[PDB]
């Protein structure tokens, strides 16, 4: 099936999750007068956003990736929910509220676990 | 949209005559916001009883710039009005194969064929005796 | 310079018959022919430009075609209101003028 | 056989598009070359070996898209300058000591209000009507008029139109290449060369030549209403000069408004024209009159005659000298007829000042007197040319975008698609 | 993709010299090379030698260099990726013993170890 | 050698092929005045047709390679040519041509080839 752009919004945060690309490219293209200039901060915002996620995901080692796996252990205090009642159970939506609080610990997290891996395989190949 | 033209004439041999053609219909509007595109030049034709078609000639109502037929010989004249809204064609030097409908015609804005004659003018006879 | 030989000169056919007209150029002029239609007493009406493109409002039964140097129009199932003189144009030079009846 | 698909970043292929260009260059002049990037001192121009491109200098967006670049330069220099709206009153001229320029006294407003002032001003025949005799400018009936700010030039600067990134520009090196076609020899550059915008009629001036021989363009050359861009390729010598010593005069016509006015003739009253070497203007049309057989006929006889009528600036050579625009009478070069097998000509030019420079019905301009003697010397490097509907060409133009297509015929835009799909047996790991 | 058409069958008598034509069309002329070949009578297929359009270089057999005349004109370009060209071949000592058929080949690919393989041939022309 | 900007455009697709760096460079920098917004105008146009191209090579796995490999196998319908046939006759500029009308296709293909590959490694690294 092909649902269309969030058309897996209301779906499980499982099924949802194989329709990534879906999202992914409507992301950046789309799904002096008056508007001349009202389009032209529309070009510059659109570009924006996008690089910066795509700069969390470079300094995450998730460059290129949509589902992409790290080293930072879940900490049940951000959700102390089973993985079968999430997945199977939740939609990303309601997801997003439950750990608006704990994300921008997240953020940091995945970020210094990149920095000391790779200057780990910095020292893996100074053999 | 038809061109407007003006009525019969009867001249003598030798004498002189001005056929007008209202090609537009403004007054004192053309400046826009975007650069408009050239306009089509306005042709001017005539047909003798029971003859051929035959072309006299061209004239740019933007800036007057004109292209006489050779068989003429200077003897045509093509101008327009101030306000560009009506050309006009005289011919001097009258004879009696002068004697045709004469005809001011015009290609369609939105099209690029400049000799593909989509408005023409009711027709203007001119008799020569 | 150019000499434009359109056959035939006249014609006559019933209502719902098919006609051809030609138009022949004395040398290569591209795409750059157009047809008109004039009744007696009136201002030709243009039928075909550019060889063959219908001009808008004409009726579908006109149609036009050619390429270099061979050109053709053609009235599919003719009407009464068809009876007038088809003539090709190149430039300032027409054809000699078709007379259907 | 085992085939799959691979993905291909850079791969040398591209679209015929067009986007927005830019400007690059080297007192302000009108063309704002200094709000321009500068021009590159090292200007990288790849050749494309075994390539061939179809050109179509008709259909070229560049010219398009420059000749509104111009015109939105122009309206850009006349903003901020003075409003000789308070000049369209009634003059009482007289004239001076055949008839041409006149002398002009008029009630002015002064920097008070309430205060009037008797100045009087010299004007060319051209920019005044009749109602001591009563005259008015030309322009008031139809159009407000501006001053052209007496310290932005006229000057044609050498200007460069680049392509943004990630699109490029495909010059053609064919020495004989005419208008259209598939260029033999191609390469590609990052912005043209350095084109003077020179606003010329008849006579296409300071132009770029021709190597090899004499080319000769149009569209349809069988289409009398497709004006010829013949270009020459050795330059002839035109020499134009206005000798009166005319003087400038300040007027104060409000708070910070200052009208210039054409003070008086200080020497001689005499004709503007300008000098042709009639040797190398006969060589010249020679050179031309052989290439148009080409087309026409081994033994058909060329002819050319002047102007058959219209506007000042297409019957005539009109052009800017120094700051002053001239309109010279061009029936002394077109004035022979070719069968198949010290000298100077010389121009009786007016001079006008009230011009509305392109079409535009409703933006007059003034120019404000050059003090001095005015003379500069130019090359006539093209031709605009319009055959009679024997076959007989005579000058003409006024699309000053015909002036634009002399020089970007060499020049294309392409958009660069680096993205290829292409098989081979080539497969990634799980 | 394209034609090579040759000249006729021109007969002449030994001692004089044949100039036989090869004209090109469908592809790009100075993107491969034009092979020489001939068939005769007494023999079997003999290959005479290949030019490069684009770089006017020549390789031929030491069987016929002393006698081969092999030169190219330049292609005049029909499309981006179309020309039409014009290839000559000429022989100086001829006898009775190079009666034959004559013939032109394109090469088959524009690099790698076949660039110059008579794949693309015209019709032949009959000699003396 | 170095042939320059698009100086192998004449060149066989192989010959070409090694040449990648060399349009890949000239991509991004190149080889309220009149003049002020249409150089910004250029700017903001050059940035958008390079994320797109980028955007592309992301969703396909790609992201970082100039030459790039994948799953989806040639469909002779495609194009019933021989390799070499192709590399070592063929400009880049007549093979875009020949494939104009199924590019859009393999676009697709390369797209979900990838959102499953990753779905399948978020598997494979499930113990
Ligand atoms: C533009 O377009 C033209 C025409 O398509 C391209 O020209 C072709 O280029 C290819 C590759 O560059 C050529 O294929 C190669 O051919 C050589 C054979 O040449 C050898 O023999 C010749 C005769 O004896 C001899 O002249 C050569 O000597 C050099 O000097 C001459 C001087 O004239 C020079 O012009 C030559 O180029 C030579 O450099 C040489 O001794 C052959 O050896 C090659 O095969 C080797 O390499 C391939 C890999 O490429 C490998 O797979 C093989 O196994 C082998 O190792 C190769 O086939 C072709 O002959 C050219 N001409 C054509 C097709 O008509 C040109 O390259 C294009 N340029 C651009 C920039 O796009
Ligand atoms: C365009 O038209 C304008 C008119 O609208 C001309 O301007 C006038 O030009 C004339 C000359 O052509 C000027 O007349 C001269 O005025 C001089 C100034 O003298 C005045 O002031 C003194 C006080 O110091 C008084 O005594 C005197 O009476 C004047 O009122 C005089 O010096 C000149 O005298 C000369 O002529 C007389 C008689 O001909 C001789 O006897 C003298 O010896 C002497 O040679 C002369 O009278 C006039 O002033 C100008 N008007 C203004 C407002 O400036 C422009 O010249 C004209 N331009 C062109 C190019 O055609
Ligand atoms: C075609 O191109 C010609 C040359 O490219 C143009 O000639 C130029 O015309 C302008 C104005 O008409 C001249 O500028 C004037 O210069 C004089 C003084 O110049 C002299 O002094 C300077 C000292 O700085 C010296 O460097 C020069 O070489 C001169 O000796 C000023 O008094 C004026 O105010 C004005 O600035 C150019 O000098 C002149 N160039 C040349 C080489 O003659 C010609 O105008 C062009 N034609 C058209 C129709 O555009
Ligand atoms: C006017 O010019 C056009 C384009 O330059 C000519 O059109 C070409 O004509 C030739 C010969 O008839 C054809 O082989 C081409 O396919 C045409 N190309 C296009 C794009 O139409 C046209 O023939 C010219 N007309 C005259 C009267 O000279
Ligand atoms: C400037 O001189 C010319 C030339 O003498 C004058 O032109 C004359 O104008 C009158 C009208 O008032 C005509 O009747 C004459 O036929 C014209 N003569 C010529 C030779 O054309 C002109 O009037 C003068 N202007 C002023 C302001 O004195
Ligand atoms: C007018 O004449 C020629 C153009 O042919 C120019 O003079 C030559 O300019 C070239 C390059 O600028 C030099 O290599 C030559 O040495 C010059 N020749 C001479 C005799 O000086 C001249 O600059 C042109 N003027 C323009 C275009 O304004
Ligand atoms: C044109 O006229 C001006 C004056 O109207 C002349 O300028 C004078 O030049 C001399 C030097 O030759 C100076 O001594 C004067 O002071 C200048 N006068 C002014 C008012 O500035 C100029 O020489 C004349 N030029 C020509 C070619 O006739
Ligand atoms: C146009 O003007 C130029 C320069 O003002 C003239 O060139 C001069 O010609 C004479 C005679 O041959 C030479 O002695 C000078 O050296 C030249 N000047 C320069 C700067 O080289 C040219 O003759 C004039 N041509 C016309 C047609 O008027
Ligand atoms: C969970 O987070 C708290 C603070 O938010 C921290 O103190 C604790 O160590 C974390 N536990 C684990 C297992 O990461
Ligand atoms: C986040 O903090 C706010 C503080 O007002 C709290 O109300 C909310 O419950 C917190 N989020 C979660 C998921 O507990
Ligand atoms: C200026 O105004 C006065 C007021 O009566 C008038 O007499 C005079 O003729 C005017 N001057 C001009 C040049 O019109
Ligand atoms: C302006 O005045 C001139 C006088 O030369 C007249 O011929 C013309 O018709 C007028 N034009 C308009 C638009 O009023
Ligand atoms: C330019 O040259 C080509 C080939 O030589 C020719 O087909 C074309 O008609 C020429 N252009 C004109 C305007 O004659
Ligand atoms: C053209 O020449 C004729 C005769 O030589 C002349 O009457 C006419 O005024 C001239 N036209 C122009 C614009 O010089
Ligand atoms: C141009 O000059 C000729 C004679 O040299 C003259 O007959 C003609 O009238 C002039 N042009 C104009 C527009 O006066
Ligand atoms: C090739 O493409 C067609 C449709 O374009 C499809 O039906 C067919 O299955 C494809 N074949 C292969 C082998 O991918
Ligand atoms: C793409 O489709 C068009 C449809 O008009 C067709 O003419 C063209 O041949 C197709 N492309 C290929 C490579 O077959």
């Known amino acids: 099936v092909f649902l269309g752009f969030l058309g897996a919004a209301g779906s499980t945060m499982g099924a949802a999750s194989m329709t990534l690309t879906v999202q992914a490219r409507n992301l950046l293209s789309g799904i002096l007068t008056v508007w001349g200039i009202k389009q032209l901060q529309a070009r510059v915002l659109a570009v924006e956003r996008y690089l910066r996620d795509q700069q969390l995901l470079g300094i995450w080692g998730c460059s290129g990736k949509l589902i992409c796996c790290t080293n930072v252990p879940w900490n049940s205090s951000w959700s102390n929910r089973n993985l079968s009642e999430i997945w199977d159970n939740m939609t990303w939506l309601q997801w997003d509220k439950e750990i608006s609080n704990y994300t921008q610990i997240i953020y940091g997290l995945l970020e210094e676990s990149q920095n000391q891996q790779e200057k780990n395989e910095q020292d893996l190949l100074a053999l | 949209v038809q061109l407007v033209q003006s009525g019969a004439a009867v001249r003598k041999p030798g004498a002189s005559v001005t056929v007008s053609c209202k090609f537009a219909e403004d007054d004192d509007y053309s400046p826009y916001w975007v650069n408009p595109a050239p306009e089509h030049f306005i042709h001017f034709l005539r047909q003798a009883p029971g003859q051929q078609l035959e072309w006299l000639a061209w004239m740019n109502p933007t800036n007057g710039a004109v292209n006489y037929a050779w068989y003429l010989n200077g003897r045509v004249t093509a101008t327009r009005d101030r306000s560009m809204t009506t050309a006009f064609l005289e011919v001097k030097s009258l004879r009696s194969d002068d004697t045709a409908v004469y005809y001011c015609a015009r290609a369609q804005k939105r099209g690029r064929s400049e000799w593909a004659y989509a408005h023409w003018g009711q027709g203007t006879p001119v008799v020569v005796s | 310079d150019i000499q434009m030989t359109q056959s035939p000169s006249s014609l006559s056919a019933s209502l719902g018959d098919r006609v051809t007209i030609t138009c022949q150029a004395s040398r290569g002029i591209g795409k750059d022919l157009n047809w008109y239609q004039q009744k007696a007493g009136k201002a030709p009406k243009l039928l075909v430009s550019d060889a063959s493109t219908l001009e808008g409002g004409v009726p579908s039964r006109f149609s036009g075609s050619g390429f270099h140097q061979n050109f053709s129009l053609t009235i599919s199932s003719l009407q009464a209101e068809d009876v007038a003189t088809y003539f090709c144009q190149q430039y300032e030079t027409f054809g000699q003028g078709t007379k259907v009846d | 056989e085992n085939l799959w698909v691979t993905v291909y970043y850079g791969v040398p292929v591209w679209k015929d598009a067009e986007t927005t260009l830019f400007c690059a260059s080297d007192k302000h002049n009108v063309w704002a070359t200094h709000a321009c990037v500068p021009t590159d001192p090292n200007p990288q121009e790849i050749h494309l070996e075994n390539v061939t491109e179809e050109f179509n200098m008709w259909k070229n967006n560049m010219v398009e898209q420059m000749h509104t670049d111009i015109i939105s330069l122009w309206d850009q220099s006349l903003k901020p300058c003075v409003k000789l709206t308070p000049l369209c009153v009634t003059l009482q001229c007289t004239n001076v000591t055949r008839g041409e320029l006149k002398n002009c006294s008029f009630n002015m407003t002064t920097e008070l209000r309430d205060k009037k002032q008797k100045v009087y001003s010299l004007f060319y025949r051209l920019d005044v009507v009749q109602i001591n005799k009563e005259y008015r400018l030309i322009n008031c009936n139809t159009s407000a008029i501006t001053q052209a700010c007496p310290k932005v030039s006229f000057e044609p600067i050498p200007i460069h139109y680049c392509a943004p990134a990630g699109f490029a520009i495909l010059k053609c090196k064919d020495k004989k290449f005419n208008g259209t076609g598939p260029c033999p020899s191609v390469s590609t550059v990052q912005c043209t060369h350095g084109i003077k915008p020179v606003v010329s009629t008849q006579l296409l001036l300071n132009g770029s030549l021709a190597e090899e021989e004499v080319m000769i363009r149009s569209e349809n050359i069988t289409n009398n209403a497709k004006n010829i861009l013949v270009q020459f390729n050795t330059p002839v010598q035109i020499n134009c000069t206005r000798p009166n010593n005319n003087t400038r005069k300040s007027i104060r016509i409000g708070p910070g408004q200052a009208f210039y006015a054409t003070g008086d003739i200080i020497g001689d009253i005499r004709q503007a024209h300008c000098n042709v070497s009639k040797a190398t203007w006969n060589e010249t049309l020679g050179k031309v009159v052989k290439q148009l057989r080409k087309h026409f006929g081994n033994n058909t006889i060329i002819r050319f005659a002047n102007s058959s009528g219209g506007d000042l600036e297409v019957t005539t050579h009109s052009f800017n000298c120094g700051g002053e625009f001239f309109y010279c009478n061009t029936s002394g070069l077109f004035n022979s007829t070719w069968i198949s097998n010290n000298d100077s000509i010389t121009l009786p030019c007016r001079i006008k000042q009230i011009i509305n420079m392109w079409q535009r019905i409703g933006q007059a301009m003034y120019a404000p007197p050059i003090q001095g003697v005015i003379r500069c010397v130019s090359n006539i490097t093209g031709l605009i040319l319009t055959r009679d509907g024997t076959e007989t060409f005579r000058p003409g133009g006024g699309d000053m975008r015909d002036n634009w297509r002399s020089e970007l015929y060499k020049y294309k835009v392409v958009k660069i698609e680096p993205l290829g799909v292409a098989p081979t047996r080539c497969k990634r790991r799980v | 993709q394209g034609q090579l058409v040759q000249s006729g069958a021109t007969t002449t008598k030994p001692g004089s010299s044949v100039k036989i034509s090869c004209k090109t069309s469908?592809?790009?002329?100075?993107?491969?090379?034009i092979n020489w070949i001939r068939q005769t009578a007494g023999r079997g297929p003999e290959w005479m030698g290949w030019i490069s359009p684009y770089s006017g270089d020549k390789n031929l057999a030491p069987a016929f260099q002393d006698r081969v005349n092999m030169t190219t004109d330049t292609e005049v370009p029909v499309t981006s990726f179309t020309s039409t060209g014009a290839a000559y071949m000429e022989i100086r000592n001829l006898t009775s013993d190079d009666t034959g058929t004559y013939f032109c080949?394109?090469?088959?690919?524009?690099?790698?170890?076949?660039?110059?393989?008579?794949?693309?041939w015209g019709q032949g022309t009959l000699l003396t | 050698v170095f042939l320059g900007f698009l100086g192998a455009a004449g060149s066989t697709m192989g010959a070409a092929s090694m040449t990648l760096t060399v349009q890949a460079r000239n991509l991004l920098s190149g080889i309220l005045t009149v003049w002020g917004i249409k150089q910004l105008q250029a700017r903001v146009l050059a940035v958008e047709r390079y994320l797109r191209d980028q955007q592309l090579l992301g969703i396909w796995g790609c992201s970082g390679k100039l030459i790039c490999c994948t799953n989806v196998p040639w469909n002779s319908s495609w194009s019933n040519r021989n390799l070499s046939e192709i590399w070592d006759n063929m400009t880049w500029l007549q093979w875009d041509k020949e494939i104009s009308n199924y590019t859009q296709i393999i676009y697709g293909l390369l797209e979900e080839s990838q959102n499953q590959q990753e779905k399948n490694e978020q598997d494979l690294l499930a113990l």
């Open positions: 080949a394109k090469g088959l690919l524009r690099d790698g170890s076949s660039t110059w393989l008579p794949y693309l």
């Open positions: 469908g592809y790009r002329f100075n993107f491969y090379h």
